[PDB]
Nucleic acid binder design. Structure first.
Ligand SMILES: [Mg+2]
Ligand SMILES: [Mg+2]
Ligand SMILES: [Mg+2]
Ligand SMILES: [Mg+2]
Ligand SMILES: [Mg+2]
Ligand SMILES: [Mg+2]
Ligand SMILES: [Mg+2]
Ligand SMILES: [Mg+2]
Ligand SMILES: [Mg+2]
Ligand SMILES: [Mg+2]
Ligand SMILES: [Mg+2]
Ligand SMILES: [Zn+2]
Lengths: 129, 86, 43, 155, 60, 104, 224
RNA sequence: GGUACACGAAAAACCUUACCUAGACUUGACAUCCUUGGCAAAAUUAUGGAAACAUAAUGGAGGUUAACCGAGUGACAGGU
RNA sequence: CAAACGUGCUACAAUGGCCAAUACAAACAGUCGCCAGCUUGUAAAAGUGAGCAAAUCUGUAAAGUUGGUCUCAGUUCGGAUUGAGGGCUGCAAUUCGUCCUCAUGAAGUCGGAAUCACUAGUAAUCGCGAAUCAGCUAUGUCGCGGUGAAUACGUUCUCG
C-alpha cells in the first residue's frame, strides 16, 4: 500500500512516494542523499516538520522527485508533497497536521515587473526641486 | 584593433594619385578628403590638404608619421578659452 | 634600431595585397529555400 | 488613520536550541538575504562560546539578552516645536526587538576580526553587564529619568 | 524634409550598411518594429482597429 | 487496401484559440468517420510574444501600455490514412486563421 | 482624463479582427499590413456617398478576399455593373495582378446603428456649413427612433469657425464604458471644414452580448 | 516644479540627420491632370572623378503598353 | 568643456578578494539565425562542422555548498587613467565602435546641510531573456526566475 503526493512551491513541482517500511525511513531526494543535495541547515529539517510532530518511527521510505525551483521552493514542495501523501494514511494523523497549517498552499509567487518601475511596485528616486 | 588579414586601408584614389605624384618631381599639395586612409610608406615626402570640415589643412608627411590615419594629424573642433558666464 | 618601419610595413603589404585583390563578390544572404506556409497538399 | 493591525507574521519554532530568539537574531544579522551565511555565523560563534566560557550558549545568550533589555523608551511629541522626550513603557515584543538590533549593530563595529569572533566577543562582553550595548541601554535609561517630568503628557 | 527621406530609403544604396528601416505607413524613422515594419505609434492605431490578427491587449 | 503515407503528423497553430479547438474537432470527426486510429489531439505550449510601446506621442516614457499575440499550438498524428481518408481530407476547408504544418 | 480606445479595448475578448490572415515571414508580414490599410482607406475616403460601414480582409498564401458591407451598394455596383469592375481593377493594381481577388459586396441590415456611417453623416453636415446643434438633433433622434440604446457624440474642434476651440458632448441613455460585455461600436472621423479640422466621435450601444465567444456571429448586419 | 533632466531617442562612425562647410540640380530625386509616343529603367564594366555626376559600353524583366519608360506641357510638386 | 545639477553603475572590502570542484530555475528567442562537438589560440575569436524552422537542436545560470589561500594594509581592496599587442562588425573604427591580452594602479577607508523608495515571496540582492541593432562602456528599457528579510505602538506633528 503505497502513497503518492504532489507538492508545489515557487514554481517547483514534487512527486513524493510514501512506502511502508520498518528499517529506518532513509529519506531520499532524487536518488541522492538529501544532506548532499540541500544546504546543511534547518531546511533539511524544514521538510520533516510534519514528519516530526506526528512521528517518523513508522520508517516511511521517501522517494522524492522534484524538477524545478531552487532549494527552499523544492523543500516547500516536498513538504507539501509529503503532507498530501500523508493525507492517505490515517485520518486522525492527516488532521493533526492542519493544527499548524501545514496542508495549505502558501500562495506566494514572484510578482510581475511593471513598466516604469524598478520592480513589481518600486519607483525611481523622486526629485522635487 | 583593425584585423591582420584585412591589413591597412587607403581609398585607392589617394593611392593612384600618390604613385603619379611620387613619379612627378615638382610636387604640390594634394587635396584629399580621405582622412580615413592610413599613411603607407610610399606617401612619405608628399604633402596633403586634409579637409578639417571647413578648409584643407596642409600636412607634410615624414619617415615617422607612417602608420596612423591621415585625418588624425588635423583637427575638427577648436576650444581655447571659456568666458565667465557672470 | 629599426625605429618602427619593418613590422608596420608588413601590415601595409598585407593591406595593399588586400586592396589589389578586391573582387566584386557583392551578395546579400546565406541560407536559402525552406520558406512556405503549406496547405492541404492539394486542398 | 490606519486604525487596523493586520496579521503580524508570527513564527517561533527553533531547531538547534528551540529558542525563537535565535531565529530572530539570525534575521537581524542577515544581510543581502543570505540565510545560510548568517546561520553559519551564529552557529560558529555559538560553537566558539563553548570553548571559552565552558557553559551552555543558550543560557549565556539569554543572560546577555535579558541583560540588554531596556525598560523606558523616549518618543517624540510636539510642544512649540522640537520634543521634550516623553518616557513610555515599551511592549515586550518590541523590547526584545530593540535589544536584538542593538546587539548586532554594536557587534559589527568591534575592532575584532571575523564577525564570528566579533559577535561572540560582543555577546560575551554583555553577559557581564559591561559592554557597548549596556552603555547604550545605560544611556537611554539615564536620559529618561532626567526627562521624568514630561512623562505625564503624551498626546 | 520627410517624403524625400522616405523615397531614399526605398531606393537601394551603394553600401549595405547605408540601408535603414523606416515605417511603411508614415515616414517615421526611429522606433520601428522590424517584426511588423511599423513604428511604435502607427502600430497603436492599427492594433486598436483590428487590422493585425491576434494582437490583443495584455493583462499578464 | 493501402497506406501510401505512414505516420502522417499534422500540426496546427493559430493566433486564435476557439477556432483552433473547433477545427481540431472537425478534423477528428472526419478522420474518425474514415478508418484511421487518431493518437489524440494533444496541446502544445503556446508561444506568446509581447511588444511594449509608449502611448504618448512626444514625452512621458513612463506611461507605456502593452500588447500580446499568442500562437496557440496543437499536435495530431495519424498512423495510417489511405485514399479512403485522404480523398475525404480534401474537402475540409480550414478557416484561414488556422495554420497547418503537414510533415508527411 | 485620457481613455483607452473603446474598440481597441474590446478586441480579442468580444470583438474579432478586421483582417484575418497568417503570413510566412516578417518581411511579407509588413507588406500584408500596409496593403490592407491602403485598400481600407480607399473604400472609406473616396466612394463615400455609399455609407460603407466596415471592410474585412482575408488572405491566404495567394488568394485575397474582400468583404465590403454597405447601406447603398448601388453606387459600388454602378450602371449595369460598371463601377464594380473599375474598383476591382483598382484593387488589383493595389495588391498586384499575380493574386486572386474575390470581392463580396454584401448589403447591410439596420444601417443606422453603425458608428461609421453615423459619423460620416455628421461629418458631411458640418462640412456643408449646417449648424451643429440642428444637425446633431436630427441625427440623434433618427438613430434613437430606429430602436437602439444610447448614443454618445463628441464634436471637438474650432466649433462654428471660432478662434477658440471647444468641445460639445451629448449623452442620451445608459453608456456603461467600464463594461466589457456591452456591444459598443466606436468610430472616428475628420470633418474637413473651411476653418480647420473637426473631430467627431460616435459611441453607439447595440445591446448586451450574453453569448460568450470571439464573435464569429454577424454584427449590425441582422435585420430588426 | 510636482507632471522636464537613462525624456522624444526600442541603438548618432557612413546611413540615420532635421545642423555647418563645400561640389552639383531646377514642373525638379517623388505625384496627378492634361496632347503625345513607347523598340526601358536597373544593375554592372570603363574614363574623369571626394563622391554627387558626366561622357562609352551588355542595351536588356517585360508587353506593345499593362505597370512603367518617356517627350511636350502649364496648373504645380516640395518645406523636420 | 573653467563648470553645476538629475538619474544609474562601480567601490571603499574578510557578510570579502582569488583559485579548484560542484548542485538547483523560469521565461524568451532562433535559418543572412541559434550554434553543439572537434582543432588552433595566454584570450577576445578563427576553421571544420553536424542539429534545429523548433515541448526535439542551440542560447555554459549566478548567488548557493565544500576545500585552499589572503590576515585588516590604501592591501591579493578598488578599478580609474594611460601605453603596447591582438579579435570581431563594417566600404570604412582618427574625430567617434566595442571585446581580449599585457603594462600602470586616480580617488575612495561609509560620505556635510538635506533627502528617496518601500507593508512578502516584498526590501536587499544573484543571474537569465527579448525589443530596436551589421557592430555599439544600454551600467538604459521591457520582462523571467534563485535566495530572501525588518517594521507598522499611534495620528500629536508633516505633505497631499
Ligand atoms: Mg511630411
Ligand atoms: Mg543601421
Ligand atoms: Mg509637462
Ligand atoms: Mg550624419
Ligand atoms: Mg524593349
Ligand atoms: Mg504603343
Ligand atoms: Mg531530448
Ligand atoms: Mg561549451
Ligand atoms: Mg582587485
Ligand atoms: Mg577607435
Ligand atoms: Mg499599500
Ligand atoms: Zn510610422
Amino acid at each position: 500500500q503505497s502513497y503518492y503526493g504532489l507538492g508545489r512551491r515557487k514554481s517547483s513541482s514534487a512527486k513524493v512516494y510514501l512506502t511502508p517500511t520498518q528499517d529506518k525511513g532513509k529519506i531520499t531526494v532524487n536518488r541522492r542523499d538529501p544532506s548532499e543535495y540541500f544546504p546543511n541547515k534547518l531546511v533539511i529539517q524544514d521538510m520533516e516538520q510534519p514528519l516530526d510532530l506526528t512521528d517518523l518511527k513508522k520508517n516511511f521510505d521517501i522517494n522524492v522527485v522534484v524538477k524545478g525551483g531552487g532549494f527552499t521552493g523544492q523543500a516547500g514542495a516536498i513538504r507539501l508533497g509529503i503532507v498530501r501523501a500523508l493525507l492517505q494514511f490515517n485520518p486522525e494523523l492527516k488532521k493533526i497536521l492542519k493544527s499548524k497549517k501545514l496542508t495549505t498552499r502558501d500562495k506566494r509567487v514572484k510578482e510581475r515587473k511593471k513598466f516604469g518601475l524598478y520592480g513589481a511596485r518600486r519607483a525611481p528616486q523622486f526629485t522635487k526641486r | 584593433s583593425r584585423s591582420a588579414k584585412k591589413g591597412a586601408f587607403v581609398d585607392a584614389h589617394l593611392l593612384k594619385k600618390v604613385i603619379d605624384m611620387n613619379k612627378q618631381e615638382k610636387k604640390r599639395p594634394i587635396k584629399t578628403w580621405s582622412r580615413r586612409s592610413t599613411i603607407f610608406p610610399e606617401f612619405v615626402g608628399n604633402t596633403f590638404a586634409v579637409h578639417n570640415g571647413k578648409t584643407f589643412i596642409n600636412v607634410y608627411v615624414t619617415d615617422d608619421m607612417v602608420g596612423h590615419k591621415l585625418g588624425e594629424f588635423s583637427p575638427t573642433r577648436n576650444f581655447k578659452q571659456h568666458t565667465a558666464n557672470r | 634600431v629599426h625605429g618602427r618601419a619593418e613590422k608596420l610595413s608588413g601590415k601595409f603589404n598585407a593591406g595593399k595585397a588586400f586592396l589589389e585583390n578586391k573582387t566584386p563578390k557583392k551578395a546579400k544572404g546565406k541560407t536559402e529555400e525552406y520558406t512556405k506556409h503549406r496547405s492541404l497538399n492539394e486542398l | 488613520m490606519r486604525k487596523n493591525r493586520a496579521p503580524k507574521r508570527t513564527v517561533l519554532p527553533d531547531p538547534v536550541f528551540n529558542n525563537t530568539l535565535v531565529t530572530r537574531i539570525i534575521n537581524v544579522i542577515m544581510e543581502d538575504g543570505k540565510k545560510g551565511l548568517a546561520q553559519r555565523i551564529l552557529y560558529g560563534a555559538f560553537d566558539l562560546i563553548e570553548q571559552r566560557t565552558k557553559e551552555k550558549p543558550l543560557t549565556v545568550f539569554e543572560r546577555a539578552v535579558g541583560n540588554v533589555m531596556p525598560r523606558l523608551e523616549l518618543r517624540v511629541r510636539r510642544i512649540a516645536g522640537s520634543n521634550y522626550q516623553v518616557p513610555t513603557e515599551v511592549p515586550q515584543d518590541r523590547k526584545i526587538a530593540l535589544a536584538l538590533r542593538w546587539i548586532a549593530m554594536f557587534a559589527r563595529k568591534r575592532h575584532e576580526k571575523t564577525m564570528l569572533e566579533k559577535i561572540a566577543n560582543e555577546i560575551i562582553d554583555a553577559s557581564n553587564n559591561t559592554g557597548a550595548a549596556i552603555k547604550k541601554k545605560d544611556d537611554t535609561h539615564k536620559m529618561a529619568e532626567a526627562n521624568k517630568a514630561f512623562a505625564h503628557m503624551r498626546w | 524634409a520627410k517624403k524625400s527621406l522616405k523615397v531614399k530609403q526605398t531606393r537601394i544604396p551603394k553600401f549595405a550598411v547605408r540601408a535603414y528601416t523606416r515605417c511603411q505607413r508614415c515616414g517615421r524613422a526611429r522606433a520601428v518594429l522590424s517584426h511588423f515594419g511599423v513604428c511604435r505609434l502607427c502600430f497603436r492605431e492599427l492594433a486598436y482597429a483590428g487590422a493585425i490578427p491576434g494582437v490583443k491587449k495584455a493583462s499578464w | 487496401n493501402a497506406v501510401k503515407y505512414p505516420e502522417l503528423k499534422i500540426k496546427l497553430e493559430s493566433y486564435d484559440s476557439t477556432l483552433l479547438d473547433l477545427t481540431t474537432k472537425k478534423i477528428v470527426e472526419v478522420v474518425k468517420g474514415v478508418d484511421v486510429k487518431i493518437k489524440g489531439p494533444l496541446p502544445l505550449p503556446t508561444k506568446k510574444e509581447v511588444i511594449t510601446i509608449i502611448r504618448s506621442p512626444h514625452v512621458d516614457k513612463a506611461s507605456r501600455e502593452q500588447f500580446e499575440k499568442n500562437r496557440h499550438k496543437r499536435l495530431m498524428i495519424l498512423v495510417d490514412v489511405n485514399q479512403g481518408a485522404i480523398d475525404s481530407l480534401k474537402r475540409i476547408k480550414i478557416p484561414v486563421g488556422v495554420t497547418l504544418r503537414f510533415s508527411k | 482624463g485620457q481613455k483607452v480606445n473603446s474598440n481597441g479595448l474590446r478586441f480579442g475578448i468580444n470583438k474579432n479582427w478586421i483582417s484575418r490572415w497568417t503570413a510566412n515571414s516578417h518581411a511579407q508580414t509588413a507588406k500584408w499590413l500596409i496593403e490592407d490599410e491602403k485598400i481600407r482607406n480607399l473604400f472609406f475616403v473616396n466612394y463615400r456617398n455609399a455609407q460603407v460601414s466596415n471592410v474585412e480582409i482575408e488572405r491566404t498564401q495567394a488568394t485575397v478576399d474582400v468583404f465590403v458591407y454597405a447601406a447603398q451598394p448601388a453606387f459600388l455596383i454602378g450602371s449595369e455593373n460598371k463601377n464594380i469592375q473599375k474598383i476591382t481593377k483598382q484593387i488589383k493594381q493595389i495588391i498586384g495582378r499575380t493574386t486572386n481577388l474575390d470581392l463580396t459586396i454584401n448589403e447591410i441590415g439596420s444601417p443606422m446603428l453603425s458608428a461609421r456611417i453615423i459619423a460620416r453623416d455628421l461629418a458631411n453636415a458640418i462640412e456643408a456649413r449646417v449648424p451643429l446643434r440642428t444637425a446633431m438633433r436630427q441625427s440623434l433622434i433618427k438613430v434613437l427612433k430606429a430602436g437602439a440604446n444610447g448614443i454618445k457624440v463628441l464634436v471637438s474642434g474650432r466649433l462654428n469657425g471660432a478662434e477658440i476651440a471647444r468641445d460639445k458632448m451629448y449623452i442620451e441613455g445608459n453608456m456603461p464604458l467600464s463594461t466589457l460585455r456591452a456591444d459598443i461600436d466606436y468610430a472616428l472621423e475628420k470633418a474637413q471644414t473651411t476653418y480647420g479640422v473637426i473631430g467627431v466621435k460616435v459611441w453607439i450601444n447595440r445591446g448586451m452580448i450574453y453569448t460568450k465567444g470571439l464573435n464569429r456571429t454577424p454584427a449590425h448586419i441582422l435585420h430588426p
